[PDB]
Paper text:
Deregulation or mutation of DNA-binding proteins, such as transcription factors, is closely associated with the pathogenesis of several human diseases, including cancer, making them attractive therapeutic targets. Here, the structure of the DNA-binding domain (DBD) of [name] ([name]) bound to its interferon-stimulated response element (ISRE), solved by the use of native intrinsic phosphorus and sulfur single-wavelength anomalous dispersion methods at I23, is presented. The structure shows the presence of three molecules of the [name] DBD bound to one molecule of DNA, which is unexpected in the light of previous studies suggesting the homodimerization of [name] on ISRE elements.
Taking advantage of the dedicated long-wavelength beamline I23 at Diamond Light Source, data were collected at a wavelength of 2.7552 Å with the aim of solving the structure of the complex de novo using native intrinsic phosphorus and sulfur SAD methods. When calculating phased anomalous difference maps with ANODE, the three [name] DBD sulfur sites gave anomalous peaks that were stronger on average than the DNA phosphorus sites (∼11σ versus ∼9σ); however, one of the sulfur sites had a much lower peak height when compared with the other two sites (∼4σ compared with ∼18σ and 13σ). The phosphorus sites were used as well defined guides for fitting and building the DNA double-helix model, which is important when, as in this case, the DNA departs from the canonical B form.
Numbering used by the authors:
A (entry chain A): 21 to 134
B (entry chain C): 19 to 130
C (entry chain B): 22 to 130
The structure:
DNA sequence: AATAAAAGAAACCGAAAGTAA
DNA sequence: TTTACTTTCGGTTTCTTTTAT
């Protein structure tokens, strides 16, 4: 009934967001760019695109109707990632203090029994 | 299965020690205790707690051991509905304990 | 149905400050609705109404159950939503002021 | 120093599934 | 079965305290 799992899998499977790539061929671990908005390498378009995309895809942000607030978009996805049972951050694999920094996440498989 | 069987039958089930938690509260035998546990709770075991409901289903024609598939929720609902509408029984709702372990309801027997 | 009468009764008492009628026909009322994280929020006064609903239904027992104001708030909110006896006037609600509240109109039968 | 972004935790929401009477 | 709430689901928004430039 949720949308985050399928949606994010789709954005990675698309080549739309550079740095949003699978790390393995088994499609279980992926990399998600996570740049601090204050950095010099940061451009609003390319780095905020994934967060804006989630706000567009849910009804939250409507282009031309609403005033843009990019930190809000990032907070939504971060908190959504944290809370979801579908995603587990591999905190020992995240690279946040480099140019082109990223976080590493695992998509949990569904459970065996009921 | 027919009319005028509920009152005496339940009195008989209380006077026997067969159903744990189905005991009299007074010596005048006008008020009694009936376990009323949610089937999902952890303490719930199907045998002991569904026994009274299964017993009513057997005593009336509704359940036949070995011929029909058991449905404990159906037995509970059937006996519940009988108690509410019964002129022979009146719930003392101010003494019932439904949000405790081994929860129960308290009922008063209407004299004629 | 106990909510319709119970809530009408809670408004008619002056017990909960901010739980007041807006009109003289007793069809529309104001129900305080503050976020529990805000600074003005005090646990006793603002959760009192939700606490009262939890008491009046069997859900909370003083001294037997651990207090959970967030669950109290959720139950009352969801109850109002499903109620055919209650309809929120969303064009009147004031959620982003100090002392925020919601506005509800009582459906006549 | 200052301004802006960011962080976890928890309270929060509607919708729907669930439960009881 | 209808009415009437209550609980659960899948994220979302807020609160307060760090972190980045």
């Amino acid at each position: 009934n949720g949308k985050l799992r399928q949606w994010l899998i789709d954005q990675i499977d698309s080549g739309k967001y550079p740095g949003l790539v699978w790390e393995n061929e088994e499609k279980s671990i992926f990399r998600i760019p996570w740049k601090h908005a204050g950095k010099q390498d940061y451009n609003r378009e390319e780095d905020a695109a994934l967060f804006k995309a989630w706000a567009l895809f849910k009804g939250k942000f409507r282009e031309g109707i609403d005033k843009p607030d990019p930190p809000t978009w990032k907070t939504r996805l971060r908190c959504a990632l944290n809370k979801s049972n579908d995603f587990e951050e591999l905190v020992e694999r995240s690279q946040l203090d480099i140019s082109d920094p990223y976080k590493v996440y695992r998509i949990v498989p569904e459970g065996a029994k009921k």
